Enzyme design. Structure first.
Site, PDB file in Angstrom:
ATOM      1  N   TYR A 118     -19.641  50.672   9.364  1.00  0.00           N
ATOM      2  CA  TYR A 118     -20.481  49.466   9.379  1.00  0.00           C
ATOM      3  C   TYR A 118     -19.715  48.170   9.115  1.00  0.00           C
ATOM      4  CZ  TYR A 118     -25.013  51.731   9.894  1.00  0.00           C
ATOM      5  OH  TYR A 118     -26.091  52.421  10.407  1.00  0.00           O
ATOM      6  N   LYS A 126     -18.868  64.396   5.402  1.00  0.00           N
ATOM      7  CA  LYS A 126     -18.205  65.277   6.372  1.00  0.00           C
ATOM      8  C   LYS A 126     -16.704  65.301   6.036  1.00  0.00           C
ATOM      9  CE  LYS A 126     -18.204  67.951  10.123  1.00  0.00           C
ATOM     10  NZ  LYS A 126     -19.076  69.112  10.481  1.00  0.00           N
ATOM     11  N   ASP A 140     -23.590  67.946   8.373  1.00  0.00           N
ATOM     12  CA  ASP A 140     -24.353  68.615   9.423  1.00  0.00           C
ATOM     13  C   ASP A 140     -25.241  69.679   8.791  1.00  0.00           C
ATOM     14  OD1 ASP A 140     -21.986  70.064   8.817  1.00  0.00           O
ATOM     15  OD2 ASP A 140     -21.833  70.875  10.816  1.00  0.00           O
ATOM     16  N   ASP A 144     -27.821  56.300   6.881  1.00  0.00           N
ATOM     17  CA  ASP A 144     -28.675  55.839   7.982  1.00  0.00           C
ATOM     18  C   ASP A 144     -29.399  57.036   8.631  1.00  0.00           C
ATOM     19  OD1 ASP A 144     -29.574  53.831   9.898  1.00  0.00           O
ATOM     20  OD2 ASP A 144     -28.290  54.843  11.364  1.00  0.00           O
TER      21      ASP A 144
HETATM   22 MG    MG Z   1     -21.213  71.516  12.723  1.00  0.00          MG
HETATM   23 MG    MG Z   2     -31.490  53.353  10.515  1.00  0.00          MG
END
Ligand code: MG
Ligand code: MG
Ligand code: TAP
Ligand code: TAP
Lengths: 415, 415
Positions: A159, A229, A282, A306
């Site tokens: 961002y 992640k 994920d 987000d």
């Molecule tokens: Mg994955």
């Molecule tokens: Mg959003």
């Protein structure tokens, strides 16, 4: 030549020792918002005034002061004035403010006015609580199991807006530097290639996670989950996770649970043991559907936050009633989290629930917890009563269709 | 000193004019996988052999050839041999291969062996179809509305693995370059700051999207949705979206629908009009829950694809039976998409559905569509029969608990 009018009656909120000092008659700047802002904002003002009036028997009253950003700002201040410097000054000066949805123009070089407000004012916490209101139509079987609070880092990550267009002189200059000076060989296609930079810092991470843990303590929550992640982005997302755990150990006495890696933090007020844990991003998007009851306070970076806040809002049927705040050390800006939905603007049709619950957060932030509780009670009653706006009604049987303004009234009726 | 044994009976698949030439007796390399690989892989081999035997009345037979990657590779090839060069050569040479889950070590400098395989072999398509199997326990009310196919870009994005640790000489060198040479002022905290690079190219984007549209055509699908966060990342994610639409116009006769921005592409085989459209990534994670029937083929970048494929798998109750392929222009690698779950390894307990349905994809990729259809039919029957492994059984009433091997047999029983 300011077009803002400082209320004759009303006094400025002040800040001392990281504690807000809120008078009985605080001046609160508000941005009406574009599109359906014209519908939801009046409903918010009325509901908030009623909650405040009822809670404090007329002793307290907000002096609302309209300020500008977005398409309305261009109509007031002129052609290219989407975000007047005055608005940044006023929000900082008055400490607490609220806004409807904003129109950010396309084709003129602005990513997002919402993001601009957050970054310019250093509101590094995007705070998005997601709970279920009994009676809300939901696409999932057990939405009542969702009761989480998202602490989304608001000042860094991708961002930051650092990037260059494919085939641009700048992009080629960066790529040359990477390949030639940094010895980078991992760019699959270095021609016609856009480039973005993702920063993540120790200070940025720790101020966010610090707020999340303090919140878990203040509100006797069960756990804080660092979502990241980090297995792929070791030095940004992975660093975020590591610094988060380190902060818990260094500042909150976090101790190893079993063989790790989870920690326990003792709530110094209730003696409850708060679990500090982590989940890969994920997998976390699966966990919130499959094991929602296991999650509570969430701490994550800007982009992940987000995504997570949208996914959680959808599952509780709260796409149009999801509250949100942006909080920094010097001020805070509460916001409708939905878009401008211009096709409905002025029809008094859409759900004002999002901006109303963001105002609930605002009142709570001000220490006006009684008024905030009245809004929650009112929202709960209205939804339970099945007296709701079209977006809920069309998904239900035996509901009563209410206009936006009318739903605002139903909330008051249920306080 | 190779420990791979080329089957005496068996012939190599070849590739001519972008068309696979598959003999009746193809040699197929397989990686057993670590952890529960020892359970699910034998089940996969048996189910696939049965489908092939039944479909072609003994005329065709796979010659399976074991190859190595992961913890097992270290046991075979030696201490630091997690991914032998031989395995990359063999997959490319034999064209079609399948693998169980892999253990990637922590603390030795490897992000992911799965990612390494994808990048090294240039398997730029991560293909993950997500559908519902009647009878599967799901956390959502209407999982049957989900029938999508994910084309996840597999060679670029932040997965390139270009990043430097906070406080490292390299990180500081990059940051200095950014601030001093590129004039970057947007890094909130430039000290103790990790840095990652996100590339997105025209060629990388278009080869991915090309495959997605060709798939929609080949399979008479209804639409292709470009999913991106292009409003914030204008030159990577936004570029991906723009190039995707451009490709549709330039190579597939895409024409404007109404006032845009959606396009229609005429299916040259069925005359069906395929819609090309786009959704912002956070909103898309809501849309897949709220309006799943509106989506079909999805085209997105590497990280978004990672998230979307997990979220969709969860909602159909398919966390443990989600199939996946990695496809490039010269070879393809089919994979179990779940982890190694070592706590259950060797107990013949876990669901082999994921690797079995990845093998279904493999057979279909080989043109052995009859055998592939038998696996789908078998999977559908077994699940409908409520004869299932513990992960489904514990969520159901009146189900019969099957071992992993036994569920493999139930699939065959239902062909
Ligand atoms: Mg994955
Ligand atoms: Mg959003
Ligand atoms: N350039 C701008 S301004 C821009 C562009 C993209 C995204 N965003 C941001 O991303 C988020 C989504 O914005 P968007 O523009 O994609 O959404 P919008 O086009 O403004 O709204 C899309 C749909 O959401 C539903 N909706 C929104 N608010 C509602 C309410 N209060 N009550 C009931 N239904 C409501 C309506 O659905 P139905 O029509 O089905 O009833 C509406 O058509 C927002 O945070 C927005 O600020 C902004
Ligand atoms: N270093 C490595 S190897 C690493 C690290 C992180 C992520 N990943 C990757 O990220 C993904 C997730 O991996 P992970 O390690 O986080 O998962 P794992 O720890 O291996 O598995 C977690 C849980 O998922 C369930 N599960 C997995 N496979 C199943 C099956 N076939 N049948 C039934 N249940 C199953 C089990 O749930 P229950 O115990 O509740 O029954 C299991 O305990 C994989 O693609 C993996 O390759 C890899």
């Amino acid at each position: 030549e300011s077009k803002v009018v400082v209320p004759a009656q009303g006094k400025k909120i002040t800040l001392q020792n990281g504690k807000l000092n809120v008078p009985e008659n605080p001046i609160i700047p508000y941005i009406e918002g574009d599109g359906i802002g014209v519908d939801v904002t009046p409903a918010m003002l009325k509901v908030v005034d009623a909650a405040v009036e009822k809670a404090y028997k007329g002793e307290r009253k907000i002096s609302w002061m309209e300020i500008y950003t977005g398409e309305k700002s261009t109509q007031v201040y002129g052609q290219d004035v989407w975000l007047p410097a005055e608005t940044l000054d006023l929000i900082r000066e008055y400490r607490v403010a609220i806004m409807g949805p904003l129109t950010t123009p396309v084709g003129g070089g602005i990513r997002s006015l919402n993001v601009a407000l957050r970054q310019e004012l250093d509101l590094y916490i995007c705070l998005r609580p997601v709970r279920y209101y009994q009676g809300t139509p939901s696409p999932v079987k057990h939405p009542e199991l969702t009761d989480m609070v998202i602490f989304r880092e608001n000042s860094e990550d991708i961002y930051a807006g650092i990037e260059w267009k494919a085939d641009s002189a700048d992009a080629e200059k960066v790529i040359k530097f990477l390949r030639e000076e940094m010895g980078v060989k991992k760019i699959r296609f270095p021609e016609h290639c856009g480039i973005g930079i993702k920063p993540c810092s120790e200070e940025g991470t720790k101020r966010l996670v610090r707020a999340a843990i303090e919140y878990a303590i203040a509100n006797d929550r069960d756990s804080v989950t660092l979502v990241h992640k980090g297995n792929i982005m070791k030095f940004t997302e992975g660093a975020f996770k590591d610094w988060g755990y380190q902060l818990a150990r260094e500042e909150f006495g976090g101790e190893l649970i079993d063989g790790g890696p989870w920690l326990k933090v003792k709530n110094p007020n209730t003696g409850k043991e708060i679990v500090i844990k982590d989940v890969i991003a994920d997998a976390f998007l699966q966990q919130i559907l499959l094991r929602p009851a296991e999650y509570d306070v969430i701490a994550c970076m800007n982009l992940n936050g987000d995504y997570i806040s949208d996914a959680l809002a959808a599952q509780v049927g709260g796409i149009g009633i999801a509250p949100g705040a942006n909080i920094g050390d010097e001020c805070a800006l509460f916001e409708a989290t939905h878009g401008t939905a211009p096709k409905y603007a002025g029809q008094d049709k859409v759900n004002p629930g999002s901006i109303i619950l963001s105002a609930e957060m605002m009142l709570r932030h001000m220490g006006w917890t009684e008024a905030a509780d009245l809004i929650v009670k009112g929202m709960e009653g209205a939804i339970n009563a099945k007296t709701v706006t079209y977006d809920f009604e069309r998904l239900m049987d035996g509901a009563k269709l209410l206009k936006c303004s009318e739903f605002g009234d139903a909330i008051i009726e249920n306080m």
